[PDB]
């Protein structure tokens, strides 16, 4: 029944339209959903704009009108010029005449702000098409009508606000460069009259709604107008005094003054300097007298959230931080400006105590700007000693757990602040620590906050002041732990103590006996069943080791052995109560220490002893697994095997090239284990179906394979002896992994195989051309068939596939020359397939592969393979690239699509393609590829975008080819074309813009 409005054979039933609108907005459920689908179909009808005349004239529903202005809006923006000009006259005059009819009706001008705003914006769309060339009296008539009515004068401010936005703020993406500059020039040359109307309304009052709408438009003007309209009039005095008084105008006026603190102003005139000081003095005066004094508790005010207090305090922080970062040097020399400068910063201090993360980040950014300047600029830090002293407390008390971005910002400000006054910082911190022990501020959150603060300033004090500070801090922290009862308390204190010491390696390195006692405690802590202690002890251990490794590898005075030997000897007892993942962290730490030993025989012996336990379990299993593979069905055995390999990955991660001896001990049996595991995965999917890949049993077997590939990848990525890589490792690896991947069903293939092969080609690809050929043959076609039916399935194989092709195309392009012509054709298809992905990991590599392939072909010179490549694939690459550039579904790849396109076009205009790109029949003989390239492109665009004129297509290509050595201009010309294909009747002269 509701679908009657969709029939344009009959005449519109306005009453039937008002109901389906009301059923959509005020309704619910199925009838709302159905009214939605008909209102979309109605507005989407290409003839609906015709019936917009009578909807907006006879309907009583404001939503129905609004919708019809949308229908109009789509017509004005996209098909305006295609209309017979009589319709352009009618829509124009209807839209204007309505706007005044709504303005004069005080009833409607107050109850239908949404509709009047939509009508103003629709008018602005017409002005983008018609003004000023076919409407040069708009601005003079706008100023004339303003004196007639306060309501039309206010609405004119709205029209001017919207006009300035469409022209200057949101034009770069929505119109051509030429059309934007035309509108910017037009507004620029008639602004003198607009400003006087704006300044008169502000100066003469008195309607607050009219003053606010004029201040809102002024906010938009300040983005672009020249300095003189602000500093050569009285307007700074009005903004900084009169309008800071009323709260109706205070919010907009603050935003205006914030923009003014960013205007382009000559830094040598001292009058403008006094005008910049004066509006700041006035603004701060109005705040202190009409809003709140500098002592006010902005923390509590913000938390109460009365009215617009939150928005106001946000705007105050934006105003102060913006102005002071640019102009505070204007206040630092004159003694009469010193109170104004410190009051401004004292307001920031109070703003900085508000519990509001995003606001705090805004103030923190300014504090960073300030303390950085006091750290470098002479004679400045004494001005702010009391501001800085308060800031230290604010930052120490709001320290966050090391968002990590916020923490790093807090650490940087606090390190600066500590260098500016080391003595103040220490006194605050010890003071806060005392009140942690006397119980006045004792809290789990408050002791953590303080430890982070103390830990964050490491490396900023003198080594001997640091030594006494660290000693004092550890001492009080331990007396805090003893005083506390219960586990959950004594666990958090003891954790912070370990976090602090982990932050002070310069202290640990100078006092071995202390460092030794630390590590011994972490070892005791690796048996504490209380949750978090074990994870804490392991993280601190590897953290300290990274910094102090040299002190574990040497033999310290009055010890018989390097402490590493002591750690390794008791490793089984030390880690006996840790989870596997924590055991691997422990071994990784030991690997860090061992790699610091540069005597090869000592290093290898340390490596042999560290790996004793996993090597013994390995040897046992490989003997029991081979005789005979029923053991690998046991869940416990695959877990033990997985953890042995993970242990090897962990030690290999920290030891890199030095891990080679331990790899050689297990390598041949590990690849054998890889083959055996592979058979059982295959046997299981055959016996149970594809669902077997989801079972714990097979997920555990695939874990073994993945960890084996991760170990080999980890080593090869860090190996320094590549001769051993190729001659010892690569051949058994490929035999073990390539055929198994190729001959498995898709669901049983491990994408890690591709990732491992990418690393092999990356490191030693130049040394194994027959190996790279064997990798392609075994993974190229069978992986492509997995991923070329949609953009969804096998997401990991998709990403690794194109990383593999990318490095092969970089390192051993010879492999693609050996592909049979049918397989090379799939390679080109695979590249373009990557273009069409929305997934960024695939799209970026696909564009990069295409670019690198073109350069690979160009480097071959005038040879048959390069000539045949262009004959077969040049226009495929040109048109596939044009397709993703123009379909609006791959905007994230614009820059690299443009780069590729220009490379393809420049090839022809530099005559690097030796053969003709056409068939001998279709074009006369001797015609340049350049002439044929323009013909192919003109024909291609004409059929793809039939609504473009031949002159548009011809002016676009003329500009594009001429600009194929200038990426920034080329891109601007592509952007202009992307705009023109969205409408009808685009001006072809636009492409002469550059």
């Amino acid at each position: 029944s509701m679908e009657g409005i969709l029939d344009f054979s009959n005449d519109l039933d306005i009453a039937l339209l008002d109901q389906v609108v009301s059923t959509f907005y005020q309704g619910s459920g199925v009838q709302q959903k159905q009214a939605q689908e008909i209102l979309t179909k109605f507005q989407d009808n290409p003839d609906a704009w015709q019936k917009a005349d009578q909807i907006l004239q006879f309907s009583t529903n404001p939503q129905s009108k609004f919708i019809a202005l949308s229908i109009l809006d789509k017509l004005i923006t996209r098909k305006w010029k295609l209309l017979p000009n009589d319709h352009r006259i009618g829509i124009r005059n209807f839209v204007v005449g309505m706007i005044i009819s709504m303005c004069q009706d005080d009833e409607v001008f107050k109850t239908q702000k949404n509709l009047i705003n939509k009508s103003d914006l629709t008018l602005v769309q017409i002005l983008k098409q018609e003004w000023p060339q076919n409407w040069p009296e708009f601005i003079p008539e706008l100023i004339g009508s303003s004196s007639s009515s306060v309501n039309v004068c206010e609405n004119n401010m709205i029209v001017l606000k919207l006009l300035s936005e469409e022209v200057f703020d949101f034009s770069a993406e929505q119109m051509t460069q030429a059309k934007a500059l035309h509108l910017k020039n037009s507004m620029s040359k008639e602004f003198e009259q607009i400003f006087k109307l704006c300044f008169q309304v502000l100066e003469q009052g008195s309607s607050s709604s009219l003053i606010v709408a004029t201040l809102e438009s002024l906010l938009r003007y300040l983005h672009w107008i020249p300095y003189r309209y602000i500093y050569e009039t009285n307007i700074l005095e009005l903004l900084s005094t009169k309008f800071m008084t009323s709260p109706d105008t205070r919010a907009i006026t603050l935003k205006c003054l914030t923009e003014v603190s960013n205007l382009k102003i000559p830094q040598d005139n001292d009058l403008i300097k006094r005008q910049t000081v004066l509006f700041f003095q006035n603004t701060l005066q109005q705040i202190a007298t009409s809003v709140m004094p500098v002592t006010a508790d902005l923390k509590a005010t913000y938390a109460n959230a009365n009215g617009n207090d939150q928005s106001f305090l946000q705007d105050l922080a934006m105003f102060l931080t913006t102005y002071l970062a640019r102009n505070r040097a204007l206040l630092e020399s004159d003694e009469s400006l010193r109170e104004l400068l410190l009051n401004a910063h004292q307001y920031l201090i109070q703003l900085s105590k508000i519990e509001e993360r995003e606001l705090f980040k805004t103030t923190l950014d300014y504090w960073h700007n300030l303390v950085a300047d006091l750290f470098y600029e002479p004679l400045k830090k004494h001005i702010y000693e009391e501001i800085c002293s308060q800031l230290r407390l604010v930052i120490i008390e709001n320290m966050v757990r090391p968002t990590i971005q916020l923490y790093k910002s807090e650490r940087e400000v606090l390190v600066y602040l500590t260098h500016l006054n080391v003595i103040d910082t220490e006194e605050i911190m010890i003071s806060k620590l005392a009140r942690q022990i006397d119980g006045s501020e004792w809290s789990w959150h408050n002791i953590n906050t303080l430890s982070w603060a103390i830990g964050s300033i490491s490396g900023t004090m003198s080594e001997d002041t640091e030594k006494r500070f660290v000693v004092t801090v550890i001492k009080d922290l331990l007396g805090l732990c003893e005083q506390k009862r219960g586990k959950d308390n004594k666990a958090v204190v003891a954790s912070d103590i370990m976090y602090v010491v982990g932050q002070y390696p310069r202290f640990l390195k100078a006092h071995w006996n202390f460092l030794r006692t630390v590590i011994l405690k972490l070892f005791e802590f690796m048996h504490e069943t209380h949750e978090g202690v074990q994870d804490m002890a392991c993280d601190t251990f590897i953290k300290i080791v990274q910094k102090c490794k040299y002190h574990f590898v040497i033999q310290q005075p009055r010890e018989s052995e390097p402490f590493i030997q002591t750690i390794i000897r008791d490793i089984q007892k030390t880690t006996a109560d840790l989870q596997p993942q924590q055991v691997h962290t422990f071994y990784k730490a030991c690997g860090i220490i061992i790699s610091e030993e540069r005597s090869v025989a000592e290093r290898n012996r340390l490596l042999s002893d560290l790996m004793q336990l996993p090597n013994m379990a390995w040897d046992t299993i490989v003997e029991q697994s081979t005789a005979n593979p029923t053991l690998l069905l046991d869940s416990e055995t695959v877990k033990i095997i997985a953890n042995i390999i993970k242990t090897n990955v962990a030690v290999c991660t920290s030891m890199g090239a030095d891990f080679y001896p331990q790899l050689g001990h297990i390598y041949y049996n590990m690849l054998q284990l890889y083959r055996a595991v592979s058979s059982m995965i295959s046997a299981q999917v055959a016996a149970e179906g594809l669902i077997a890949t989801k079972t714990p049993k097979v997920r555990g077997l695939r874990t073994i394979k993945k960890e084996i590939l991760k170990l080999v990848e980890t080593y090869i990525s860090k190996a320094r002896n590549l001769d051993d890589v190729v001659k010892v490792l690569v051949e058994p690896l490929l035999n073990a992994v390539l055929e198994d991947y190729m001959n498995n069903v898709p669901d049983a293939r491990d994408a890690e195989v591709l990732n491992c092969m990418t690393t092999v080609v990356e490191k030693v690809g130049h040394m194994i051309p027959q190996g790279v050929i064997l990798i392609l043959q075994s993974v190229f076609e069978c992986t492509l068939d997995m991923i070329n039916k949609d953009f969804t399935e096998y997401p990991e194989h998709r990403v690794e596939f194109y990383k593999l092709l990318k490095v092969i195309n970089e390192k051993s392009f010879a492999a693609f020359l050996e592909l049979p012509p049918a397989a090379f054709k799939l390679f080109v298809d695979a590249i373009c397939w990557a273009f069409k992905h929305n997934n960024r990991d695939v799209e970026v590599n696909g564009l990069q592969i295409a670019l690198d392939l073109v350069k690979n072909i160009e480097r071959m010179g005038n040879v048959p393979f390069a000539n045949e490549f262009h004959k077969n694939y040049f226009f495929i690459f040109v048109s596939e690239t044009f397709f993703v550039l123009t379909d609006s579904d791959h905007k994230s790849g614009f820059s690299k699509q443009a780069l590729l396109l220009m490379k393809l076009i420049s090839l022809v205009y530099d005559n690097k393609i030796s053969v003709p790109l056409y068939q001998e029949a279709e074009v006369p003989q001797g015609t340049s590829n350049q002439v044929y390239l323009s013909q192919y492109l003109a024909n291609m665009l004409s059929n793809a975008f039939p609504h473009l004129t031949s002159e548009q297509i011809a002016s676009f290509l003329s500009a594009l080819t001429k600009q194929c050595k200038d990426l920034v201009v080329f891109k601007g010309t592509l952007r202009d074309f992307l705009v023109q294909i969205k409408e009808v009747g685009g001006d072809p002269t636009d492409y002469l813009f550059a």
Binding site: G479, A491, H511, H530
Partner: peptide, 15 residues
């Protein structure tokens, strides 16, 4: 007072 904190670390406990 380094040997002092040191001895205190040693006694660090949770029980």
């Amino acid at each position: 007072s380094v040997e002092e904190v040191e001895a205190g670390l040693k006694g660090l406990k949770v029980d």
